[PDB]
């Protein structure tokens, strides 16, 4: 699963937070997004292309992610497209439990922060940069430098 990401919009106080899960190490890559269009949506996603390795992503077939725009840039940056359903097991199945876990980590931080944008960021740092509770346990971001690394 070397540079597969699966990536799902979903909202939070009025707010569109454009989610991406890299399947193999856990890790979080989150962004505030306008609005939930074609436009938006590939300026998003062509930030993540620019610091992060992706050869696919995986998503639902909303209309911000299956469209002209978006079908032209990720042909253009080299990068495989797999989508169904908004749900569905095939390209979608990390999504919910994600984005759930994501929602309680920034209802958590949003007290004590003095935007919803930094709680978002402190959410995912929680997320990337705490080592899962378990005995050889690597935090996401470890794993996935590790994951690259080798690669």
């Not at 436009?39 to 992060?52: G, N, P, R």
């Not at 909303?62 to 095939?90: A, D, R, S, T």
């Not at 004590?112 to 996401?140: C, Q, Y």
Request: with cysteine; hydrophobic share 40%; proline share 3%.
């Amino acid at each position: 699963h070397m540079g597969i990401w699966q990536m799902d919009c979903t909202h939070f106080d009025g707010k569109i937070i454009l989610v991406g899960i890299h399947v193999e190490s856990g890790y979080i890559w989150a962004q505030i997004i306008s609005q939930e269009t074609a436009d938006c949506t590939v300026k998003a996603v062509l930030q993540l292309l620019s610091a992060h390795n992706v050869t696919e992503l995986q998503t639902d077939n909303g209309p911000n992610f299956k469209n002209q725009k978006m079908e032209g840039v990720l042909n253009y940056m080299g990068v495989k497209h797999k989508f169904g359903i908004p749900g569905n097991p095939q390209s979608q199945a990390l999504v919910e439990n994600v984005n759930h876990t994501l929602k309680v980590w920034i209802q958590k931080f949003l007290p004590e922060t003095t935007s919803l944008d930094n709680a978002l960021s402190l959410a995912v740092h929680s997320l990337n940069f705490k080592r899962r509770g378990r005995i050889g346990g690597m935090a996401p971001y470890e794993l996935l430098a590790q994951q690259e690394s080798l690669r």
